[PDB]
Design a protein around this nucleic acid. Sequence first.
RNA 1: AAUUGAAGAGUUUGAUCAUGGCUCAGAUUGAACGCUGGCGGCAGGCCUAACACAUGCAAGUCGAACGGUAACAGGAAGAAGCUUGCUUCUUUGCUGACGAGUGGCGGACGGGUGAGUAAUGUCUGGGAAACUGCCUGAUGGAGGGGGAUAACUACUGGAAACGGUAGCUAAUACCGCAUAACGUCGCAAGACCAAAGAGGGGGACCUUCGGGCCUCUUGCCAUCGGAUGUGCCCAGAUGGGAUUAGCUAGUAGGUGGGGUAACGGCUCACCUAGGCGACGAUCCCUAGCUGGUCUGAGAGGAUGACCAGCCACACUGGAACUGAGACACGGUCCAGACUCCUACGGGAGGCAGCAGUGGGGAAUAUUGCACAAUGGGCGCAAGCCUGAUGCAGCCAUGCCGCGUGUAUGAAGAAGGCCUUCGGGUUGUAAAGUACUUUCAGCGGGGAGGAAGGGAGUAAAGUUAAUACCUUUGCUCAUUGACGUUACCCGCAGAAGAAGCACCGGCUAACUCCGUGCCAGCAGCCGCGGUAAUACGGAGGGUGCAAGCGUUAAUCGGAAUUACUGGGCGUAAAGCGCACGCAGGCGGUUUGUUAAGUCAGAUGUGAAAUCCCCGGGCUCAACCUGGGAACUGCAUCUGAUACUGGCAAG
Lengths: 80, 71, 82, 205, 62, 85
Amino acid sequence: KIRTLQGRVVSDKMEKSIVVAIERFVKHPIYGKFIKRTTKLHVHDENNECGIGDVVEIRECRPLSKTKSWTLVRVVEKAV
Amino acid sequence: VKAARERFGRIVQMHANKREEIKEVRAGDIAAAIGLKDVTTGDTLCDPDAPIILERMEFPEPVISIAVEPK
Amino acid sequence: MVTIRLARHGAKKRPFYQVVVADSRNARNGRFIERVGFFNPIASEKEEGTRLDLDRIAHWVGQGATISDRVAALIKEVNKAA
Amino acid sequence: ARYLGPKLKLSRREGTDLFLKSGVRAIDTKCKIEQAPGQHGARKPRLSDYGVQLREKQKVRRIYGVLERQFRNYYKEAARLKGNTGENLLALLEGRLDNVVYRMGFGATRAEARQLVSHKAIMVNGRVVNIASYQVSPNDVVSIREKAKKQSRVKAALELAEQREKPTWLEVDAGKMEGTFKRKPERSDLSADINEHLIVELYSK
Amino acid sequence: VTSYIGGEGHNLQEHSVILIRGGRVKDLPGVRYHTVRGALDCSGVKDRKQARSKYGVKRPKA
Amino acid sequence: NIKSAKKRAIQSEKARKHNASRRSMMRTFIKKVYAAIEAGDKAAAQKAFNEMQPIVDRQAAKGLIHKNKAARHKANLTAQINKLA
RNA sequence: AAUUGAAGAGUUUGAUCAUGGCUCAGAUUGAACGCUGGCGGCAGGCCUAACACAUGCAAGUCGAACGGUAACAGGAAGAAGCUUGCUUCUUUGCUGACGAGUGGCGGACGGGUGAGUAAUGUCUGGGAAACUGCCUGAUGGAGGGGGAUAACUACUGGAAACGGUAGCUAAUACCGCAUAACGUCGCAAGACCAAAGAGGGGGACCUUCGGGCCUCUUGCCAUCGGAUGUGCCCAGAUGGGAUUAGCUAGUAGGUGGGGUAACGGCUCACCUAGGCGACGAUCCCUAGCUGGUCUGAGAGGAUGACCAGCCACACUGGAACUGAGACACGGUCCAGACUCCUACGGGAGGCAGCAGUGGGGAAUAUUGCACAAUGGGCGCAAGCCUGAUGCAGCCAUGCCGCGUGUAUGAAGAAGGCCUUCGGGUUGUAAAGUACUUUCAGCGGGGAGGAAGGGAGUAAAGUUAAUACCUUUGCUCAUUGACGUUACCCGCAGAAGAAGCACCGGCUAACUCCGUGCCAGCAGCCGCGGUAAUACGGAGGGUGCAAGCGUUAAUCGGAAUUACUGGGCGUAAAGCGCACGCAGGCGGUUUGUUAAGUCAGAUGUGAAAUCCCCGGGCUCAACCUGGGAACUGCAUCUGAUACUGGCAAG
Ligand SMILES: [Mg+2]
Ligand SMILES: [Mg+2]
Ligand SMILES: [Mg+2]
Ligand SMILES: [Mg+2]
Ligand SMILES: [Mg+2]
Ligand SMILES: [Mg+2]
Ligand SMILES: [Mg+2]
Ligand SMILES: [Mg+2]
Ligand SMILES: [Mg+2]
Ligand SMILES: [Mg+2]
Ligand SMILES: [Mg+2]
Ligand SMILES: [Mg+2]
Ligand SMILES: [Mg+2]
Ligand SMILES: [Mg+2]
Ligand SMILES: [Mg+2]
Ligand SMILES: [Mg+2]
Ligand SMILES: [Mg+2]
Ligand SMILES: [Mg+2]
Ligand SMILES: [Mg+2]
Ligand SMILES: [Mg+2]
């Protein structure tokens, strides 16, 4: 298997360099509520294969630039 | 004369032109004991088992007095 | 190199070495890779006195580990000669 | 470390004989037991919960001749150990070598027995033991050293000892002056006007 | 800061060296410290017998 | 400072000077190869390339350059000497 | 078996209830101060100035890499004063060894410190693009040449630190050449890369009779593995502030060169116009992090000394060189601040190594011993080095033991104190009389921490060999700083050894006397203006005890920041009121999903600590065996009610 992660796009124009947001629900350390948690990663996709709105699958990888260590693998949903 | 004991450590004899170090100091000799805590002038340093106060010379007692303020 | 040696863990005048493998360069009671027994130069002729995980010693001795002269003597005295 | 002060007075405060003068006659009196532990001893001070709570644990301490810090530790240990912390306090307390030596009758008073333990005048299982607080296990055998086997003290000591109500969890002799802590004493076979929950709750607040 | 000088009688004056202890006086507002008798230039209380540890008075030669 | 392992200082100076002239020279051959690359003179490139290979390779063994640098140099220079030459 | 444990009280009022602050009882401390002070065991000891530093010590070591002789010894290319085989001069590097020099390995370890660092670190968990001395498994190499140089020598400069010219020499120093794959580059064809010798012994055979030659032990080159170490990447967690809301040009990405051990804006040119931020960027302030420590019933709060892991720093700022490793605590260069030496031209240095001084401070130690043990550096080894370490010195700073006696002793002495003058109390306390001798003291004896190394001798271990060399038995001498060790046995004599706080309520413990809103006390309420249990003394008492108080400090009590676990009509508290973005929350049915949630499994969660059961020091503290624990993170695989997503209502 392949340690991977879903998450939608955001920010388009960067030239084979899409950035992906990864929500996650987590319990609050003291008070117990589960709260949202965005996590923005600088992803690489050779030949701009996607764009804003897209729920995308990614995996961790070799360094490609400053804050950019994740490649594009699949895509799921796109249009608006 | 203070009812406190002291522990000898380093010892020096001023030797014309060199502070030579010594480990022992016999009777009939003079020297300076380094590091002794609360020893003022006129005090007797004796054996703790065979304790004695010695005569202690005299303290000339001043003849001139003056007020000083720290500028 | 890695080595098997004694780390002093007793108490003043009542030592208790710990046989343990480590990078020679670390401190004696410092960073170690793995413990492999103990040697209690006291205990008298009681219930225990020494203990050597000889398999693990031998294991490490296999990857080019070396033996501290005092540990060597200890191994060559826990027998394993017949 | 030891107390050292006038011993009957202590008993006089507690309003009981704590056998600090087990010695011989009287069993108290020729003391004026109670009615004046001081100049104002002759009064009826109604004392608070905290007072009796104190007085009671204070009682136990004087009986065995154990001081606060060590006694605290005895309580803390007693606490940790499984079972009614109240009673197994007394267990450690009773298992003290010096106590055992008195309980076996090798010494007239608990204080006397202590002096004995101190003077290397007692051995346990073959081994000599100096310290009064040596914790005695079951099947251990406390015996008097030959060097000082039955001299004046210990004679009279074993003598009036046997004329006292006697133990159960250990068996004495008198010929070889040796005995065996046969087993730990149970709470049933030791008591009187001595409670615990008082002295237990005291160290718990 | 201002500091109390408990005990009966004292030396202490303009250039004395002393030791401040902390501790207020519910009678002198703004006085929030005590002087520690018997440390440095501050002599102990004269002839005091009960509670000499405070007031820095050495045991009267038994 | 007054610890005879100061001879260490004087030794490493000798060392720098040694490493100095060699590593100087090595570089000046790697310079030569690119000279062709820039000039366009396709022959001169292999001429010098094949001239520097022994230097660079040796220097890796001598341990004043250590392995993959020697690798990388001739590696990507190959990748350049025949990209038009 | 194994984190199984939760107390309240005082104080607002004439009194009451509630509210609410303040205060107290507990535990803890790297403490200090005051009074007092016997021992021992284990432990702790500059928390402030990361302030400056005299002096000594803290890194050396190999002659088995090389030329070598200055000293030390023996032997002397061999000799006197004659003291004829005992000497001390003069010569000889012969041998032991060894000053200085080349070389090698180490100096990047060990030890110190907490300045810097709010994330260039740290903790947990993952990851791919890397190098890695010594130790190691494996395959082959180990050919043949060459140019130099310290030392040294002759002149010559300095006060010194340092040297300056000229000439000569050795090597495992250095550089070609040959050799060249399972190595590097390459699609391949092919190109191309290394190194070193040194010792112990020895039959013949041979010899310039130095050795060659044989053998054995080491060392050198190369490559692929291993082991250990390190570099690099991502995610979540890791203080306070919005009276800091905007930040950002190598900024964010791409391409191509260059670069490093390695991935990468690490760098450079060009091109896109991005990148970060209210899920707190930016900017300020404080801070080394964790294991853990203290408190707490827990959840929490507080904290990061001692031990161990990790990071950073080495007078200050900056920089590289050497090297496997450093941008180097006791290295180099440059600048600074400062100090020191000078024969005035010039030189030298950085205790946050150990000890120690000055200074700051309420406050923190000896300019000690030994490498004997453990462990590190070099060495074949012996050995040498080792202020790591093992010990000792100092301080009640703490924890734990023990002692400072034990029994007996009355019309209950005297003295003091109270008293209604009958007495009562101190008080079995004292004295006296029996008794004991721990610990101190004096004398004897005496474990254990020592396992090893050195000679010898016996073993198809070798090899041409009964040599040399390796292993192991056995044998004989021998290796401790602590050290007058622990511990044991003798000997004398109760002998050397009790204080501190408190006694109005909370709060365990009461009177007289002095004093008279004075002198003073006081944590809180409040005592004192003539019978003060509250001030000061005394007698008596209570509590702790070699300590006791006081102060400083954290948690508790405090459900008084309330997640657990609180409140807002009048006690502090509903915005004057509506509309509304972001966010939080969301009726009812089916299917699906499987993020949250749940279940199981595997790695993991360093050791020490805590806890359980044991074991070892006479006990305990302390030390130790094994477990439980580490309530966590990650991954794979499952479960589908609830939550969330998607589809149709
Ligand atoms: Mg004690
Ligand atoms: Mg280099
Ligand atoms: Mg030499
Ligand atoms: Mg700081
Ligand atoms: Mg070649
Ligand atoms: Mg590129
Ligand atoms: Mg490139
Ligand atoms: Mg709380
Ligand atoms: Mg610096
Ligand atoms: Mg230094
Ligand atoms: Mg009387
Ligand atoms: Mg009372
Ligand atoms: Mg009055
Ligand atoms: Mg009073
Ligand atoms: Mg609370
Ligand atoms: Mg409230
Ligand atoms: Mg109001
Ligand atoms: Mg309203
Ligand atoms: Mg659903
Ligand atoms: Mg643990």
